[PDB]
Subunit: 240 residues, 6 copies
């Protein structure tokens, strides 16, 4: 269904049991190493990137015409960036930083997000992985030790290509509450085109014709006689 | 048919029930948050980009030779850019801006424009979607809060690849009224090449020949005798 | 046949009934809006770009070996650029400029040039269209209103990929009159290689041999006797 | 299995009997030529690059559904850079440096790492080689001789594309010890989604129904009679 | 065969009856318009570019193993650039320059070079054309009129992809006369590897063996008796 | 086999009878024209570029599993650059330099290196040619004549893509003599992983079992009786 519920489930699966995310924001942390259980751990942040490549193809075999409202299959790329900052005070050389454990944590998150098909949204039809990039670039302006040497920053991206089912009926003015008012005015004094409304069958009228002897024709009015006009629920009489 | 009627229908489907477009113009808004029902909403704008990739292929199976005038299938890319400006006065951190709702609004517009095949123009043969790009770039020069920090700008593009039927007969000098005068002069004193005009059959003349005994030949003038000259409507006699 | 006659026909089809071309030249116009019938119209220009991608493939099924002179199929890309200048004095905002009508005029020219197969040259075998680009770039240095704001320029290109038949016999020193003298001298004192000349049959001589009894051999001179030497027109006797 | 054990085995295979690695670090060496057995050898270093292109495809024929926990196939690119510094004091001209021996050492390492399928990890399914690049760039700022001429640096990369099997069960909080605390708190006060736990069968209860004479139906409760309730281990009685 | 004879034939076909080449050199001409027959013509030059993409594939079906010396098929790209300078004194506007005639001259040269398969070299197996580029760039620093406006330069390239047969026997020290001395010394005191020399059969010796009764064996020396030793020309006796 | 022996053979084939290489080094020559037999020839140099694209695929049909040691097929690109310097004192114009002879010399080297399959190394399985590039760039800083005009430099590259067989047994510590000491110490106090050693069969012991009447089972110890223990060479008794 809707991408905000899906993205909330995606970040929940991300931080579920794999990555510990101390803060969420676009900024390398300048906090000291975090002390928990008398053990020091590096600062980290997560940047949730805006959803891109939002495309609706209507051209997949996994779209069922249920006959109520037209369904769609939507493709999206959901991009998350996790950054860990390793201070140079404790990590003197590049090779002693725990890059291996970061890669292990990254592959574990990839496996957990891929396996959780039924746990992210029921309407997910495909989840695929783009090749992840791991960078050991320096921090933005974060210095640790004497001489003002830049701290080690380990940056890992996760880009999930995900295909899921949607319908028109899933979107309501409640999810647009802080961006768009319901029932606004048209920008050029035009009328809004109202979509179709689900039609309810609250009466049926049948008018049958008794055709002439050779065969039914149904075009000329003298070749058939009106027999009766039938209202399938008797209560439709005198109502419409 | 013609692209201005089609583009008017396309923008109408866009603002129909999905995106609320406060203004139309190439400029990030410096208006305050718009107050409606005592609720504040971010400023927005739409840029309707000029139609590009206008190509006529005449090489598709959905072009019927009706025998009146030659039809064409035209492909075009119609590009719309919607920009929302979120002031930093209310939205202090990047992650608290409602990117999810913007993506939901974008996917809803994509679904609505794709479904409305019969509502945009009857002569649409294909509508497809390029991957949409969502950017969280800063505003052009719009500052909100103290220190003159740039406001958040959420930019979303929609590029519709659309294939539709056209004919020569659909274009008249009325739709060119403010760009081109009808019946202008040639730039090098040349003559204008007049296209074919629909021919009306207002008389038919048949001259049949009685051929010689072995077989019809129809080349030599002594091997056939003129019998009669027939004018299919009798009123063509003494007229032409 | 030859590209100058073809290009003259191509520009003639262009300005025939679609685009009104006020001037032909590589320069955005600084003339005022042109008044015709008391109606003001924007200035325009056309740039006819030099023919590029001139390739001769001799590898198509539409090349007939007529046995006189070797034919060729030539491919070329013919590029025309039409620029309209819309003054900011009348057109205050970008969205009120008549981009839709420009796109309509462009698609009409594309359809008219594509349909006119028999009208441009009889030897055209294919005409195809590259995707057209429509730009709303500013004018070169043309300012309209106060503050010296650059005028709106609408630039539309048309690139026709066109395949046509040619032969060696179609090119004569008349079409090179102002670029090359006929019968020039070789740059390194070399001799010019004269192409083959159409051979005319003005006499035929047959010398037949009466072969020996077992079979014709035709190699050894004692196994056949000369019977007669036949000159097919009697007037070839005593002539050659 | 896990990439840190695999990478430790990969560097071990690298330095096993092929490359002699004096130091491990991102820096061209400024140490003098190393004297061993009264023979001088050039300084060298190895840079172990961070693992990139970590992708989990779950779409290979070499993934067995064992029915315990879902397996995965992971692809990774492991990149090692070996740099040798040849002083200009001994190596006066470029062509007398032993580039051939470096290329021989490089091809030997490539062959040894490729052959050792069973020696790096048992769960390796594929090891492939990207084209190696050998550079004779100068040193960073290392000068040897008079005039401060830059020393010769021979840089050779080895990029192994490697596909291997993984499972969720292979990752424990022990391998994340210095990067992540076990059993942390959720960043938005959310609950952690616990993965499935291996279910142990410590009792089985069977309730069979005696169906009516025509056939089993199993939907309506009057068409079958409860016969007995069977506990497969007798000790499950009075326990659950 | 050899490329210098082929390239001499290629430039000869170029200037044969199509392009008039006043000078050959890499430089836009500053000579005045050339007066011949009291008619003024624009200056021109030709740049013969160095042969590139020289590749020997030995992997084509048009290479016959004649059994004397191994043949090859060589591919080359031969690039010629013709530049015409049109003074602004006579050619005031861009559109009045005779670009059409230049394109006609270019297509005529392309057709003539393509047709002349038997006239350039007998061993040509393929001649193909890359797409030609025609530029209306300004001259290098050539000014014509007042204000020092740059003259019009029309630049047209011709790149012939050509495949031809070669053999080792075609290259002799005569064609290298001014670049390489015959019979030079090896740069590292090595010996030169002499190619095979055509072997002439000036004698034949046959030694036949009379085999034992069950069958020929030809391995053990007691199972066959030497009968005679035959010298096919009797004069080989007492000679070798 | 090993690339240094192969590269020595490759440069030997290069200078064998085709290119005369006066010096080997990365530098355009400033020596005068070389006088031999009273004839002046241009200076030249050769740059042997470091071997790149060293890839071991183990995925070709030309790799035989001999069952001793695992073989490999190695691909490499061997790049040689030959530069000739033509002084402007003798060569006044560009077109009079002997580019044709240089191209002839280049194609002859390409043919000779391609043909010499059995002469470069016996284990070559493929030799292919990349498209060669011929440049007429100026010299680095070499001036000839008055005004200090840069001398003509003709640069031709030869890039051989070559596929050849290798094995682990071909590499010994003798070929690494000046780069790596034999039997070095591990960088992290690890043990070296010794490769398999060729196993020699110096004794065979067979213990056969007499099975029970219904059939051989070979799992339970009571269903078979030990008959004898056979040592195939009698001298293995009392030895092991």
């Amino acid at each position: 269904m809707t991408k905000p519920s899906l993205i909330s489930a995606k970040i929940l699966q991300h931080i579920n049991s794999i990555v510990w995310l101390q803060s969420k924001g676009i900024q390398e942390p300048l906090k000291p190493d975090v002390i928990v259980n008398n053990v020091a751990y590096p600062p980290n942040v997560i940047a949730e990137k805006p959803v891109t490549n939002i495309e609706v193809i209507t051209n997949s075999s996994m779209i069922e015409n249920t006959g109520g409202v037209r369904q769609f299959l939507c493709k999206a790329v959901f991009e998350y960036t996790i950054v860990w900052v390793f201070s140079r005070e404790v990590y003197k050389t590049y090779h002693q930083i725990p890059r291996s454990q970061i890669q292990d944590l990254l592959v574990f998150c990839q496996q957990f997000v891929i396996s959780a098909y039924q746990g992210i949204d029921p309407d997910i039809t495909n989840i695929d992985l783009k090749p992840s990039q791991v960078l050991v670039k320096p921090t933005e302006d974060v210095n640790s030790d004497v001489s003002n040497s830049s701290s080690w920053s380990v940056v890992a991206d996760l880009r999930f290509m995900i295909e899921f089912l949607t319908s028109l009926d899933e979107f309501l003015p409640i999810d647009f509450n802080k961006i768009q008012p319901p029932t606004w005015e048209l920008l050029d004094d035009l009328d809004p085109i109202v979509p179709e409304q689900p039609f309810t069958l609250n009466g049926l009228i049948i008018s049958l014709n008794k055709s002439e002897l050779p065969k039914v024709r149904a075009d000329e009015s003298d070749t058939y006689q009106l027999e009766e006009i039938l209202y399938i629920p008797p209560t439709i009489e005198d109502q419409i």
